[PDB]
Design a protein around this ligand. Structure first.
Ligand SMILES: CCCCCCCCCCCCCCCC(=O)Oc1ccc([N+](=O)[O-])cc1
Lengths: 171, 171
C-alpha cells in the first residue's frame, strides 16, 4: 500500500462496524455521487455518530440482508465522515441503475424540515474533493440528489435545496 | 463568504472568534510545524470545543494583550481543526525564534497523562496535507514538538511520544 491519505474519515473499526461481505468493485474513476439522507436520528458528537453509523449498518445488514451498510460514506452532524463501503466498492443506495456507476453519500438524519450544520456540509464537500484527488472520482464528477434518480424524498427538502448550489450538481 | 474550503477547518466566525488585529505575515512555503497542547481543559464535542477555542483566544487577547489567539490552528478531541491565525499570519506559540518560520498547531487539553483520540490525530495530519496542497507548508515539512524548541513540557508526555513516530517528526 502506497499511502498518501486524503481528508479525515472515521474508519470502519473505529465506529465498530460489522465486517463487510461485499465484493463487487466500482470502476474508477466514478462520474456520479448521489446525495441522500438516512431519514433516521441525527447526532452531533463522535460518540453519538459512531453509534448511529453502527445503527444504520445493522439495519441494512440485519433487516435488509445487504453485504454492508449501503452507503460508501456517511456524514455526521458532528462534522466527521464515516467510512461505509468506501471508494472502491459498489453500494446499495440509488437503485440497480445508479448503484453500479456512483458513489453514495448519506447525511445521518432527516432534512425535510431541517438543515444540517456547516461542518457536515463541509465534511461532505471535502470528502468529494478528496475523492477526486485520490483518483476515485472524475475531476468533472457530478452530484445528484437521491430524489433525482429515484422517487424518494431523500435527501430531504432542506438538504436538497442546498446541494443544488454545489458547483458539481447537475439535475 | 471567504471559503470554498479545505481540511474541514471550523472557521473563526463559526467558533465566534474575536476579530484578529495581527498583521505580520509568514512567508510560504513554511518549513516547520510545532506541535503544542494548550494545557487547558479538553473537549470532545463541537459545542464544547468551539467554546474552548473561544476560551483560549479570550485569555491570549484580553489578558496577555495579543493581537489574536497565538496558534495558527487548534485541534479538538472532537476530531475537528479550529481556525486560529491561519496559514498566512505569523503565530505566537514557540518563541521569537520559531514563530516566524513555522506554523503552530495546538491540541486542546493536557496530554501528560492523557492521550488524544485517533480522530484528533487524524485531523492534524489531514490539516498538514491540506497545508502542502495549498503551498502553505513545505512539501517535505518538518514537525517539532513544543518541547523540542522551548523549555516546556508541552505537548505532554503522552502526545509527544506519538508525534515522535510521525513520518515528518524531527528533533
Ligand atoms: C512522493 C510521495 C507521494 C506524495 C504525492 C501524492 C500525494 C497526494 C495526496 C492527496 C491527499 C491530500 C490532498 C488534499 C486535497 C484537498 O482536499 O485540498 C483541496 C484543495 C482545493 C480545494 N478547492 O476546491 O478549493 C479543496 C480541497
Amino acid at each position: 500500500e502506497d499511502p498518501p491519505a486524503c481528508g479525515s474519515i472515521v474508519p470502519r473499526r473505529e465506529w465498530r462496524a460489522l465486517a463487510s461481505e461485499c465484493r463487487e468493485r466500482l470502476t474508477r474513476p466514478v462520474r456520479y455521487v448521489v446525495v441522500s439522507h438516512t431519514a433516521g436520528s441525527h447526532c452531533d458528537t463522535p460518540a453519538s455518530c459512531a453509534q448511529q453509523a453502527q445503527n444504520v449498518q445493522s439495519y441494512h445488514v440485519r433487516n435488509l440482508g445487504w453485504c454492508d451498510v449501503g452507503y460508501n460514506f456517511l456524514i455526521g452532524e458532528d462534522g466527521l465522515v464515516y467510512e461505509g463501503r468506501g471508494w472502491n466498492i459498489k453500494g446499495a443506495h440509488a437503485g440497480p441503475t445508479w448503484n453500479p456507476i456512483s458513489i453514495g453519500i448519506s447525511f445521518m438524519g432527516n432534512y425535510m424540515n431541517r438543515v444540517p450544520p456547516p461542518r457536515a456540509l463541509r465534511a461532505a464537500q471535502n470528502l468529494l474533493a478528496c475523492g477526486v484527488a485520490l483518483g476515485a472520482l472524475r475531476s468533472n464528477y457530478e452530484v445528484k440528489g437521491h430524489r433525482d434518480v429515484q422517487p424518494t424524498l431523500s435527501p430531504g427538502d432542506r438538504l436538497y435545496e442546498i446541494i443544488q448550489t454545489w458547483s458539481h450538481y447537475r439535475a
